[PDB]
Structure formats: C-alpha cells, structure tokens
Ligand binder design. Structure first.
Ligand code: HEM
Ligand SMILES: O=C(Nc1ccccc1Cl)N(Cc1cccc(O)c1)c1cc(C(F)(F)F)ccc1-n1ccnc1
Length: 453
C-alpha cells in the first residue's frame, strides 16, 4: 500500500518487499547500500524501511532547502529513535517547539567565548593521557587506540559536563566512569520494520538506555546541584544558572547532560581512532603535521585556543578523515507538511534522507576519493568543495551544537599526542574493512605501534 507512493511520484528505487521494504538490502551496511543506489537510481531515489517511506536527495539546493531554508516549516525533526523514555526531552530527540526552546537555552553554552575559558582545564586530563601513553610506549607491543582515546574522552566529558577530574582507565571504580564505560544490532533493526512497537515499548517502560545508569545520573545530578548551593566553567553550571521562552526543568537537565556525555565519548573516541590510523598509514602527513605542530608551538609549548586554530594542516587532517568516515552516515529530516522543494513534491510524514557517506565518497565532487588526500582542504582548494556535500556535522540550525567543542577537544588532544609520540603500523589491517552494522566504527579494532622521541 505504501510501496506505490514513490511509484506514484515517479521516483526510481529498488522494488520493496511487503512488510519489509528494503531492509534486506542493508546486508552490506548503510554505507554500501547508499552508494549503490546513488549510481543506479540517479540523484533522487526512494526506498522503504518497512512501511516508512524514505526519500534520498543529493542536490545541494534541495539539501539547503531541507536543512536550512525550509527547516522550521517543513523539515525540522528527525525520525523517531524508538523506545526512548524520559530522554524524549533530549535536544537531539526533542521536536518542534521544545527543540527551539532547548537549543536557545543551550546555544550560549557552546559559544566560542565559553570554549576558550575551558581550554586550560581540558588539558589536565590530556596530560594524564600522555602519562598513560608513555607506559604503553615502553612496551613494543601494539595498543588499541579506542580504549586510550575513550579513557581521555570520558575524563574530558566528565570534567566538562561536571567537575569530576578523573583518570577513567586508571580509576575504573567511580560511578561516573562505570556507567559510561558500560554503554545493525538486532534491536534497532526490528524497530524499523515495526514502528508500531515503539509506543508499546514505552508502555512497557523498557527504554533503549540502561535504566541503571539513568538513575545513577539522576542522583549524581541531584548531589551536584546540592554541591552548587564558584564553578563558572561547567556544562551543568551553565544550565543551572540559566535555569534560575520557558524555564529548563531538572529532569530535562539530567537528559541533556547524558546527551553531552555520550556525544563526547564514543563519538570523540571513534573519530580520534580514525585519524591516527590514516596518520599511521600515511606517515608523510604525520611527519608534516608533527613538523607543523612544532612550528606554531615549539616542543613543550602548551596549546591554546588561539594557537589550535592557527595550525592549518591539523584542520585539513581532521576534515579529510571526517570525509572518509562521517560517523553519522546519514542526515534525516521529517517532512511534516506538504511541500514542493526545488520542483519535487514531498508529501507529509515522509522521511527525507541525506547520505553523508555516499556524498563524501562521490567521485563527482572528489578526485580519487577512497584515497586519504588531506590536501583537498588547502587554502586554494577548500573553496571548491560544496558545503552541502561535505557535511560531517550536518548544517542548518539543527547542526551539531558541539561542533566547535568536539573540534577543539580532538585537536587539543592531537597536538599533545603528536608532539611526543609517533605511530607506526603494527602486524592493523590496510584494507580497514568497515563494519557492516549501523555504526561507522570498525569491528576490527585499531592497534598500532607507538614510538617515543
Ligand atoms: C567529532 C565529533 C562529532 C561529530 C562528527 C558530530 C556530528 C553530528 C551530526 C552529523 C549531527 C546531526 C545534525 C543533523 O541532524 O543535521 C549532530 C547532532 C548533534 N550533536 Fe554532534 N557531533 C560530534 C560531537 C558532538 C559533541 C561532543 C556534542 C556535545 C557534547 C554534540 C552534540 C550534538 C547535539 C546536541 C546534536 C543534536 C542537535 C539538535 O538536535 O539540536 N555533538 N552531531
Ligand atoms: O544526536 C544525534 N544525531 C544523529 C546523527 C546522525 C544520525 C542520526 C542521529 Cl539521531 N546522535 C546520533 C549518534 C551520532 C554519533 C554516534 C552515535 O552512536 C549516535 C546522538 C545520539 C545520542 C543518544 F541518542 F544516544 F542519546 C547521543 C549523542 C548523539 N550525538 C553524537 C554526536 N552528536 C550527537
């Protein structure tokens, strides 16, 4: 019944099976499936995640319209995650008026002025990461980068969302480290075929996030609120002060902190691991970046908000890695009203999809794409890229609100790790075969050789 929609609108696409749509095509992963359909079915195609109609667009003008131009009016919210409970008030999960209220109440928290005042504090746990990196350099055996980066990513997240200056890997007993370190898949794939099961799961009070960690963060936020009763450089602080549009709730503040927590842990650790692999398989970029790191700031010169943005090559290295590996893999907006965007009728309720992975590896906009060529973002070539094709943090008023923070957190960590060690390929795997699941992480871990100086 729903499969004739994209046939009525005259939109090509793989013929879907009843009750399932095109979920069987997800056997090669979201990324492989999106690239294949872009070559065959053209610039715009449509498929079905069960009964949910999905429209893929690649035209940059349509993309701008969906993300920027007609954002508040037609394309505002994302597709329902699933059995989310009290986390429905999360800024990434809120819809329509609650999202506009939450983002305005949280936008000044990620201001360039607020990030500069937290730069010296974000380096205390970073020096602890180098201390834990020298002991691994004493061993000639390779080291998995996801655990070391996650240890740093948890320390910075805890020390920036709250005041817990910790050594996550070296102190594996604090409740803050324990809850975060504990936390496609058979569950998420079933929700796509059965969106009718989403409201039934919430009636069963079974949410996709372990409830044991939610109550632990609820009591932690309660005791931290009692600890406030001169912390002026803290995510929560900035949320409690603005609390005392409408007002921000207490449990609402608990939900957003969990967003800030996870968005800076596996997300940051994943990108940090993708960067170092490409630096290990391309040591000329590693050497030049190490040479450029010592140029703007000599050996044993601490980074600063003004100095990080000066190293031009470090920004080129993070951009190309995000291109080759956009951990989002997709951007989604729900067409909540009948709209004709760029000569195309989009009915209501249709999920409009933007394949970041496919456009990041499209030969039309990138020459030799599968090749890590960080020179694509040089001062003379960074103007040729279309900002609506390379969207690692998305775009529009619902882009990544922590883009500046995540870029600073990773760049501040990269400057200190590269000015003390070098990374050589150990036994790793050049093919770097991506995982076939719903995350843009490698199932095979990232283990390379770390050499000192
Ligand atoms: C390298 C790291 C990161 C990448 C690549 C990234 C990328 C993205 C992307 C692609 C989106 C979707 C935007 C869209 O729908 O168009 C997003 C949303 C979001 N990100 Fe990030 N992100 C990163 C780190 C972070 C961090 C560290 C935080 C906060 C601590 C954060 C907070 C958010 C929030 C709150 C949203 C939802 C925006 C809203 O719905 O208003 N992100 N991010
Ligand atoms: O917000 C988000 N948008 C988004 C981006 C791309 C596709 C779909 C979506 Cl919905 N994601 C999704 C996300 C992003 C990266 C790694 C992940 O594993 C998951 C998010 C969700 C949570 C939650 F649901 F677990 F609470 C926590 C943090 C983030 N997140 C990460 C970076 N920026 C935001």
């Amino acid at each position: 019944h729903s499969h004739g929609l994209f046939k009525k609108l005259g939109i090509p696409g793989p013929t879907p099976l009843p009750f399932l749509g095109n979920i069987l095509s997800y056997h090669k992963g979201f990324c492989m499936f999106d690239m294949e359909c872009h070559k065959k079915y053209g610039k715009v195609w449509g498929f079905y995640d069960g009964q949910q109609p999905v429209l893929a667009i690649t035209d940059p003008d349509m993309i701008k319209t969906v993300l920027v131009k007609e954002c508040y009016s037609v394309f505002t919210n994302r597709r329902p995650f699933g059995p989310v409970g009290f986390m429905k008030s999360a800024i990434s999960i809120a819809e329509d008026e609650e999202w506009k209220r939450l983002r305005s109440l949280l936008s000044p928290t990620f201001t360039s002025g607020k990030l500069k005042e937290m730069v010296p504090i974000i380096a205390q746990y970073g020096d602890v990461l180098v201390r834990n990196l020298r002991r691994e350099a004493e061993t000639g055996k390779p080291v998995t980068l996801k655990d070391v980066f996650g240890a740093y990513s948890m320390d910075v997240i805890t020390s920036t969302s709250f005041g817990v200056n910790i050594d996550s890997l070296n102190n594996p007993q604090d409740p803050f480290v324990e809850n975060t370190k504990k936390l496609l898949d058979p569950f998420f794939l079933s929700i796509t075929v059965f969106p009718f099961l989403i409201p039934i799961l919430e009636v069963l009070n079974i949410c996709v996030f372990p409830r044991e960690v939610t109550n632990f963060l609820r009591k932690s936020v309660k005791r931290m609120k009692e600890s406030r009763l001169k912390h002026r450089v803290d995510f929560l602080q900035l949320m409690i002060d603005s609390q005392n549009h409408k007002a921000l709730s207490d449990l609402e503040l608990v939900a957003q902190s969990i967003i800030f927590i996870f968005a800076g842990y596996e997300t940051t650790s994943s990108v940090l691991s993708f960067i170092m692999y490409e630096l290990a398989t391309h040591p000329d970029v590693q050497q030049k970046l190490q040479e450029e790191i010592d140029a703007v700031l000599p050996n044993k010169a601490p980074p600063t908000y003004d100095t990080v943005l000066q190293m031009e090559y470090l920004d080129m290295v993070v951009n190309e890695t995000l291109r080759l590996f956009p951990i989002a893999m997709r951007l989604e907006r729900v067409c909540k009203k009948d709209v004709e965007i760029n000569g195309m009728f989009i009915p209501k309720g249709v999920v409009v999809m933007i394949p970041s992975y496919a456009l990041h590896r499209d030969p039309k906009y990138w020459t030799e794409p599968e090749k890590f060529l960080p020179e694509r973002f040089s001062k003379k070539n960074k103007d040729n890229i279309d900002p609506y094709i390379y969207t690692p943090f998305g775009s529009g008023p619902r882009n990544c609100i922590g883009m500046r923070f995540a870029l600073m957190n990773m760049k501040l960590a990269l400057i200190r790790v590269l000015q003390n060690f070098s990374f050589k390929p150990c036994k790793t795997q050049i093919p770097l075969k991506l995982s076939l699941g719903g995350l843009l992480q490698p199932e095979k871990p990232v283990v390379l050789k770390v050499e000192s100086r």
